[PDB]
């Protein structure tokens, strides 16, 4: 038997087992510096992702693969990430995925099993986990997770940034009160007007359907802007995941503002598709091509 | 600009863009008959890990890598899988790990900081997601996620003691938490060793129990306090107070084969909990190494 | 009608007003860039106090105005600080000290009025707030509250007894009371004295710990009933009847160093439930005088 | 090492400290006497504030101190007053206070980093109990904690006094039913009619945006008032704070009513400035002439 | 067709009907003026009964009515007094009353339906509404309903036991219930018997506690509980299985002076709680006459 | 010292106290029989009362006392009856009735404070209790309380009963499900029609404004017929209890329908009084003179 300690630890009873030695601040200071550093370094984003399911991690996947230069901001407000996607339906754990996504697994090197017209992940768990392996393996990515977007940053008749907090004081606001912070999309100058020698970051939203703050963006824009809440309808696989990819990507009537995943259904009130998650991957890439055209201008 | 679809789709407004064709059922066949059949092959296993947190994952991905031939049948309580390794302290992402435990890092290929003595991941979520990818992709491992162990299998006792395990008691972890409100029964995970007249088999290896579902949360420390209240020849210790010398020290070697009971391994706080160890808090190196070594002895008794 | 901004404001209806312009990220900067030097500075502290109630924050202004030089670490698990004291009882305002406490308020610069053997101060707050103030001016005090003190850092038995501190184990408030609900990590806040190896340096003072957290809400008496959990020579008293002539005399001369353990200190109604003593309900002499009280054996031990 | 006992108590173990003895009736009898004493004084009111968080503490300040013979009743829901600013941003310490605010910090003697454009308290907390210290201290303002409005007192087509009760108690009102008590305003006869001899009292309200009774009275006015409740908007700092201190005072449509802090971005659908409060102590300072204006006519 | 305001109404839509004219203030100062003149009479009171259920206000009007100079204080924690003889067994309506408590109804003017050995008021409302509208009426009886007594004031020790009662210690209700969530302080009802230095005044008459806080509920025998808990001599014995015959019997002979404490005196169901008896279910003759039989012993100290 | 057994009980420590013995099963028929025959007597009912506070007790006194051949059935949600007035406001004990209320204090026997415009019942609870007494030794007036009026029973375009269960049920129908019972209004036929010959019954809605059920039939009957929930309006005493008075009695629009107390406030937008209850007594008296002159009609 071999592990990877087997040259180390050669003692059956692992008797000669050792740490190095360790004072417990030297292990606080070392992880509350580097928070600092990330709140700093960020605190000017240029892509904000709202939302790490399927879609946000798919979208950041490819953003951030294409433009490794561009800081790409996280916020999940769950402890996991992962969203809707550790399992299949009804709690049980096949993946299904209609072609063309499979292109996608094979680009993160995803296994799957081929059934023709759809290929299924033998767990969902399996698709999440590896993409949040590759995602978060980017220099310039950052997951703020345990973090809640509870409004947005504008401008006078775009959007301008997020208003973040920890997920636990955000559900708590119906009982003293607890104040926000903020982060901000590049493109302006330190009297917070427009510095057009900078180009504008963007906001993806990407917070689903679902959950305690289901279609987060999508509420706040409609309840701001002119603009309605679709609503969700019914499950209808061929109509729902080919309009959520065709329908994904930028908002019209917000600037520098971009949807994908579940969220595009609730706001143009689209079919729904269920256990099956082809749409979700796809979007997120639809999206990511939008925003990356976005940059490249 | 350039993505998967690229070579399929032409059109800047996707138009032409368009999954193959699907029936509602399809789906849902594809999905339930696989289950079953995860269901129908892991109903009896060779190992079952309950807690698919830093310090079981990190033992599934050592038994299961040096023996892809055994059936690992992973239960974790929680939808997303991977316990209290999705974050640091207070909220915080990095997550350090103190020397030799980077040597595990580098076999999963988890870039890191190096620090001298000890070395940070730049996020928990990179180590546990890493981990996670890499134990799925294996091909008799199972993760039975949003599924909760809430009482053992057994058999009577013997001269290795009280308690001898036989496998684990099932239910959706939805279901568990609503016990205490028409009953619901649960479903059961044998271990192998077994005949059909449910009597030992002694040409064939007993089967495991790894209990690795820490000290914290709704079920924290579920095998420890079970096997406790089952034999009261033993007591549970209580986690003291946070000594990150003594506890990471400790965890590591008191972790593997549980004195009282045969066949019954444990890693990570709940060996904590159980034995009355140290605690470490923010610091992740004791929980990979308890696994390891864990993983070493199962192997050996599979050997 | 005069107020700050009458010298540039003259327009009756403000249309003249303005602030300088601002970015956003200036302001999220501005902020979290001074909490982690908070963290960072504070990360080993001198003195260690748990809860900001009347005691906890009257033995820091004691410490603290004393020796402006040692870092004072108060940890409050409210977003307000201030505990019981802004109150007086069955929610009425009126805050009424026994004399000698009058020489504190008198200190502090908080009015009062004189009833002979004892004092009332209009509101419960006025006291509060007044030594909330001058505490949060002095230049080494740090109030990190809403966040929790959830353990004890500790170091093996010595002759001094069983429970030896070394920190506290730390979260947001809000955290700790989510975990018995993905499990989170706690942070660590160290006492000074111990080297880069985690042992004692005998050349440097050991810091202490002052517990202040009451006898009453979610988190009460809380490192009485840690360091008895953990010791189990020593038992938690419990709170006894209200009796104001016993209760508040022994609550004063009970407060300070706690014989079973080294560098910790207790006041206020903690040592109530620790050691067995009476309350007294709606009378706050003792709260304050038994922080003097604490504060005076700190300060000594620190001399 | 000393301190205020150090002529007093002489034996290091405290052996010779003794309080004076007393007995526990004579302690309820002095706390009791003088709250009936609170209530039947301020049971007619000059200046009523509902809410004592920033904006409400920062215009009670000017109020009282400008006119200590102004009977002025500050009602706080929480048992503990300063509502959000015992906080900076996501849990964190800091408050910063664009300028010209820091010349309200000078006035109240709270110290400050200054950083140009804006200053920094170091911490929230600091701010606020300095502030509720000072105010307290002021002859003729009383702190009812513990204590909410739960409506309003009318006369036919004006505010003239509040409904009251134990916060815990308005908390049950969903759960045998509790009535409240009054807080009237000066102005009128015991027929209940206007006595124009008199000036009239006012209410200010600043009970902000959060919370489980936040922007009451703007919700209560709305309720009964042409008027529209405008729903706070995006987060952005310079307009935000520009308009809630200039919209702040006197609200039009209902005589004697006055508003400030974040209840008027409620009221007025204005942007929110997030952690940043020099608008809440400066829209404070205005409401307070506005209001001192009213008293001095 | 004939009512209150039949001389002063004549117009059939009442459009002639008015009220004189008032201000709000009076009203408010009418209330608030009365209770501070309760809180000042009563706060040193010489019989307080802990909870106005059937037992509590048949003893407070065998009490009050016997001695109307006596300072009667009745501290119930619901907003509504009665505790549980609003309504007989099963949400059903009757009272059935054991012969000889029929007598007490005679007394009280209640009317009842004779069945020989036993009686029947026809609704549990109906004897509860009476005999507090005839408590209520007595010129030095007070009751505080929404207000919870949550501890007891005591002396030390003397040979009359371990616990020696001087008072209670109480909150609104709604607060207390809020306690395990900024803390909030009680006040103090003290009994009479001790000088302005706290100490006791043998020439005085000591006040007395009669506790008849039933055995359900979020409060249930509050002071056999805290009593047993401040005094380790003694322990909770239990309320045991439903026998009428033995149970009514019992809780009449067991109530009145409690053995080990000084000036404390217990009814009702609180008796059996504390004594180990019987329960007797929807039959109430035991409550009433136990209160009799308090009340008896009670005023035999007083006399 | 004298009490009821002083001639039977002998000795000191009460040794030769005893009851009569029983069998368990005696008392659970005495009980049950007795509450079956109430269900089947008021299963036809000439007057519900729904809500049984200080305007539905009020009224309760004046119809049963006028008319003690007439079934009264009150249903009351609560266990303990009362409603709001066990205290005064803010939890004080003192009762606020203004004059002529006191004619009705007088005339239950009731002691009070005179202080000329006014009167204080030393305490809310001996008001509500006396009242209480009183009723319940009325010969046809029977107390369901634990009951909760859940819907009405209707005849096409009149009241015709109304829909009840136990309260515990009503406050679990969120979460297997459990039918109502009901009680019906006198002037019907076997066969569900109208019996001429019949004068038919009425019902009195007295729920209050506050509470898990307030305002129950006003809700109602909005609900279902041309009228909307008027809304109660701010405190205002003088005209709050000169409206409530007033418009107390039969309900325009849905024959055979009365209100009284606050429940007319909600339903007609009037003011609210707080912590005064002669309106509460007197709207009862009058809404129970307009149901007196129906059934002697
Ligand atoms: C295909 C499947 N079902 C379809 C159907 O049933 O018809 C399905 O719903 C998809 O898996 C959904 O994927 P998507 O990426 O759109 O959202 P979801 O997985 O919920 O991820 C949203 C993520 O967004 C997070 N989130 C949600 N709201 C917020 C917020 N305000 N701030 C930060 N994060 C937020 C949330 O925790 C979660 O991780
Ligand atoms: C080092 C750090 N802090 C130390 C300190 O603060 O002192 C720390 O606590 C570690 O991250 C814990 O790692 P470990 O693998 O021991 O447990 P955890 O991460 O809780 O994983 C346990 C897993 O086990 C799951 N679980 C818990 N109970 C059950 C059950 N009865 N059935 C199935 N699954 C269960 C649970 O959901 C979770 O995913
Ligand atoms: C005299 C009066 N009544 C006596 C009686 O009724 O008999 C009375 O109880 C005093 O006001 C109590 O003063 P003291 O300073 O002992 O405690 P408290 O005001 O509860 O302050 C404790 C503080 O400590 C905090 N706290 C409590 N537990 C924790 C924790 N684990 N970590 C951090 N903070 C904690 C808590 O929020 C609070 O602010
Ligand atoms: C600048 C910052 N954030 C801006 C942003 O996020 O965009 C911010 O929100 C300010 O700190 C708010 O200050 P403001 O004085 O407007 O309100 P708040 O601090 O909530 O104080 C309100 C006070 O009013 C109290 N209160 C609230 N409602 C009531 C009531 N009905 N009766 C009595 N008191 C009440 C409440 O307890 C609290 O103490
Ligand atoms: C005979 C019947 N059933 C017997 C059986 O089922 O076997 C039965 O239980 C009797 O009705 C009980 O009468 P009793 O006077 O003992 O108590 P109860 O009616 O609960 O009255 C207690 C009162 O006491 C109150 N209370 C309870 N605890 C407290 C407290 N700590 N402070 C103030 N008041 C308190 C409570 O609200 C209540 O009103
Ligand atoms: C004057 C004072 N305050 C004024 C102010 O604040 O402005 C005040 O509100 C009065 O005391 C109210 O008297 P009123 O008789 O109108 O109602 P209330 O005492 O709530 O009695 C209603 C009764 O009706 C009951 N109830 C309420 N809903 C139902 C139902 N659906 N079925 C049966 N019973 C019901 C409820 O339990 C209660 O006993």
Redesign the interface.
């Given at each position: 038997?071999?592990?990877?300690?087997s040259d180390?630890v050669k003692k059956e009873?692992?008797?000669d087992?050792?740490?190095?030695?360790?004072?417990?601040?030297?292990?606080?200071?070392?992880?509350?510096?580097?928070?600092?550093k990330?709140?700093?370094k960020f605190?000017?984003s240029d892509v904000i992702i709202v939302g790490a399911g399927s879609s946000g991690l798919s979208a950041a996947y490819?953003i951030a693969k294409?433009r490794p230069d561009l800081k790409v901001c996280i916020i999940e407000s769950?402890?996991?990430?992962?969203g809707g996607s550790?399992?299949?339906?009804?709690?049980?754990?096949?993946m299904?995925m209609?072609?063309?996504?499979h292109?996608?697994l094979?680009?993160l090197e995803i296994?799957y099993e081929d059934?023709?017209?759809?290929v299924?992940v033998?767990?969902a768990?399996?698709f999440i986990?590896?993409v949040?392996?590759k995602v978060?393996?980017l220099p310039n990515v950052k997951?703020?997770?345990?973090?809640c977007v509870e409004?947005?940053?504008?401008?006078?008749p775009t959007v301008?940034?997020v208003?973040?907090?920890?997920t636990?004081?955000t559900q708590?606001?119906?009982?003293?009160?607890?104040?926000?912070?903020?982060?901000?999309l590049a493109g302006?100058?330190?009297?917070?007007?427009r510095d057009l020698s900078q180009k504008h970051g963007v906001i993806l939203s990407t917070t689903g359907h679902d959950g305690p703050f289901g279609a987060f963006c999508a509420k706040?824009i409609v309840?701001?802007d002119n603009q309605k809440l679709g609503g969700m309808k019914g499950?209808d696989?061929?109509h729902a995941?080919?309009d959520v990819?065709?329908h994904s990507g930028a908002y019209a009537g917000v600037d520098n503002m971009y949807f994908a995943g579940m969220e595009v259904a609730e706001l143009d009130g689209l079919n729904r598709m269920?256990?099956?998650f082809?749409?979700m991957a796809?979007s997120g890439?639809?999206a990511?091509?939008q925003i990356?055209?976005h940059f490249?201008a």
């Open positions: 038997v071999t592990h990877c300690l180390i009873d692992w008797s087992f050792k740490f190095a030695p360790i004072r417990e601040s030297t292990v606080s200071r070392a992880m509350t510096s580097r928070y600092f990330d709140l700093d605190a000017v490819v294409n769950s402890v996991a990430p992962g550790w399992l299949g339906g009804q709690l049980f754990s096949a299904v209609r072609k063309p996504a292109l996608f094979q680009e296994p059934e023709g017209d759809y299924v033998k767990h768990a399996l986990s590896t949040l392996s978060l393996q997951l703020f997770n345990a973090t409004d947005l940053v504008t401008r006078p301008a940034g208003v973040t907090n920890w636990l004081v708590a606001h119906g009982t003293c009160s607890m104040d926000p912070n903020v982060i901000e302006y100058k330190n009297d917070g007007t706040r309840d701001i499950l696989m061929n995941e080919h990819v065709i269920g256990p099956t082809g749409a796809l890439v639809h990511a091509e990356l055209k490249a």
